[PDB]
């Protein structure tokens, strides 16, 4: 894998190689790289203090680091917003650019024809 400076990276921490072993607190974390070497990569991570948060620097090699897709989701949302707004302007109709927080459900009817409800005792005896 090829990694540049400034990207966001996830750390997996496998047990295959013991060299450059990170701590359990650094296991399964996400951060941004600042230093790239032949094998190890300098990663800045956010550590939780007993009352605050601080930034620490660690060295994790290639076998644990992999790229992420959070910025991929942000960028695809930007692209979708641009395309949708252009289409809305072309068609002369308004569209919802933002994303909704999933409002509650509405009212509806459920039929009982050929769907007779089954009665269930609190514990199943057979």
């Amino acid at each position: 894998r090829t990694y540049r400076v400034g990207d966001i990276v996830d750390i997996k921490v496998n047990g295959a190689v013991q060299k450059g072993m990170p701590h359990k607190f650094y296991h399964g974390k996400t951060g941004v790289v600042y230093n790239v070497t032949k094998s190890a990569v300098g990663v800045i991570v956010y550590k939780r203090v007993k009352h605050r948060y601080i930034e620490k620097r660690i060295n994790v090699r290639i076998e644990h680091v992999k790229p992420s897709r959070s910025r991929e989701d942000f960028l695809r949302r930007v692209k979708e917003n641009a395309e949708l707004k252009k289409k809305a302007k072309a068609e002369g109709v308004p569209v919802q650019l933002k994303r909704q927080p999933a409002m509650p459900r509405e009212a509806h009817t459920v039929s009982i024809a050929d769907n007779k409800p089954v009665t269930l005792a609190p514990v199943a005896y057979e």
Partner: protein
């Protein structure tokens, strides 16, 4: 416990493309109010099937009341209660006017006799004994004995609790 009523609940898994029109499970329970009824229904459905509160909805909740609350009935309750040893079955009988009264008396009696609580007691099946020869317990047998008449000896009179002093010694005969 409290004041109870029959609550019949139908609930179903939320419709999906894979399985539209789900099973619409239904069961009748005893709760002081509809919120507790729905919570108990969802707990029982989680215990039985692989349906959870988040992935489900309540189609209907209705209050079942008694057909005839004015005539004396005998009720047989089959229940399972978990104590320090494990789960145990009991069939017990109650002479009441309603299934609600039968369940109230059953909770009270189980608490009094075995210290079993609401989440420790499961109501498996409550039935109305359609006729005598279906009663198996000697106390309800002696209650349904023919030409039953009995006195009430040693009836303590009901005196006002603010009547501290009396002039005559009270009687316990009528």
């Amino acid at each position: 416990m409290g004041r109870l009523q029959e609550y019949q609940v139908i609930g179903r898994h939320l419709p999906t493309e894979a399985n539209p029109n789900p099973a619409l499970y239904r069961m009748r329970i005893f709760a002081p109010n509809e919120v507790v009824a729905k919570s108990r229904f969802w707990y029982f459905l989680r215990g039985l099937k692989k349906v959870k509160k988040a992935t489900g909805e309540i189609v209907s909740v209705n209050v079942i009341s008694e057909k005839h609350p004015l005539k004396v009935k005998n009720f047989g309750i089959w229940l399972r209660y978990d104590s320090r040893s494990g789960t145990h079955n009991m069939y017990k009988e109650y002479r009441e006017t309603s299934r609600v009264a039968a369940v109230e008396a059953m909770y009270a009696d189980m608490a009094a006799r075995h210290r079993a609580r609401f989440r420790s007691i499961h109501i498996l099946k409550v039935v109305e004994l359609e006729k005598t020869e279906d009663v198996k317990r000697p106390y309800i047998k002696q209650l349904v004995a023919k030409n039953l008449s009995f006195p009430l000896p040693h009836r303590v009179p009901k005196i006002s609790t603010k009547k501290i002093f009396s002039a005559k010694r009270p009687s316990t005969f009528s």
